Structure 1
Amino acid sequence: LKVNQDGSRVLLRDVAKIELGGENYDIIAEFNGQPASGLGIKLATGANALDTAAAIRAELAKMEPFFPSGLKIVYPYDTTPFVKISIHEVVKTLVEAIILVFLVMYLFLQNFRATLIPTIAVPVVLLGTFAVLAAFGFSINTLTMFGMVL
């Protein structure tokens, strides 16, 4: 900074303290009362959601291994498993709605061979709606999946 008359060297250490500190101390996170910092990924107006968050782990899969001692990952507020579950609860109702039809179908049609035609009718009609809404742009949305069931 300076050199006063008697060649006494003034440095930046003398007039000010120098540590490697944060760029912004305005915000501070505590995972269950323990000091930490994470990542809050926000969606891109028209992004694929579940497919984007699958690739959040894909890119992050190769960062994991080169971490230093102690540095662990942990998952709060996560959308992923709710997608996983609504699919599993609807496809559950699908198979239930088949089996249950199959019993009313036997109760009336004592013929087992006849309790088979309608049983083996809607399996194909569902698949077609996957092939039709894929051909029209739609997804396996929360909506279209209740439309499979309904």
Structure 2
Amino acid sequence: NIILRVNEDKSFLRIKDVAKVEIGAEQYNSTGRLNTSAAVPIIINLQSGANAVNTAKLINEKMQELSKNFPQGLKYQIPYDTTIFVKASIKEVIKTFVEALALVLVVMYLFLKNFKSTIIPMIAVPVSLLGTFAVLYVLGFSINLLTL
């Protein structure tokens, strides 16, 4: 209805005659596909100096809260997340540590040949190792593949 010009006769030239007005997208130049199904992809860029693992965890939690209030027929999936490769690799080292400790215990139980004897060193292993974690928190040193 906006009137660009008022003619000599009392007729108002309006946008509707010259153009067609509708509510669309500001840009039509990019789309997103997830598994062929159309989808809107949101890319998260880490703030410089921020831990990747912590950030990803926070995003996933906020996604779950949002999902509860999602309109029917809307679902969220996090297809690509670098963190996953880190979590798994870190976990693998943790598994190695448990396995290593168990194997060491067996070698010790062979050499000591007495049940209790083997325990004495056993108890020492986690006290020392866990004290190390406390120290690296004081230093501010972070858990990483190399520390683990």
**Mapped pair 1:140 → 2:143:** yes
- SS of 1:75's equivalent? strand
| Residues 93 and 145, structure 2, Cα contact 8 Å, conserved in 1 | no
CA apart distance, 1:117: 1.9
Structure 2: 5+ residue stretches without partners: none
CA apart distance, 1:137: 0.6
* RMSD over aligned Cα atoms: 1.7
Equivalence for 2:94: 91
**Mapped pair 1:118 → 2:107:** no
2:16 aligns with one of 13, 16, 19:
13
Residue by residue over 1:44-82, the C-alpha shift from the partner in whole angstroms, topping out at 9 and shown as x without a partner, is 110121111222133334332333231211121023433
Q: Cα–Cα, structure 1 residues 8 and 58, in superposed 2: closer, same or farther, change >3 Å?
A: same
Q: Which moved more, 1:95-104 or 1:19-28?
A: 19-28
- Displacement over 4 Å in runs of 4+: none
- SS of 2:120's equivalent? coil
TM-score (norm 1): 0.85
Q: As a proportion of its length, which structure holds more strand? A: 2
TM-score (norm 2): 0.86
1:59 aligns with one of 58, 62, 77:
62
* Residue identity (%): 54
**Mapped pair 1:29 → 2:59:** no
User: How many residues are paired up?
Assistant: 145
Higher RCO, Cα 8 Å, sep 6+:
1
Structure 1: 5+ residue stretches without partners: 146-150
Q: Which moved more, 1:114-123 or 1:39-48?
A: 114-123
Whole-angstrom CA distance in 2 between matches of 1:128 and 1:119: 15
Q: Which amino acid aligns with 1:55?
A: L
Residue by residue over 1:6-41, the C-alpha shift from the partner in whole angstroms, topping out at 9 and shown as x without a partner, is 222221122122121112222211112222212100
| Residues 52 and 83, structure 2, Cα contact 8 Å, conserved in 1 | no
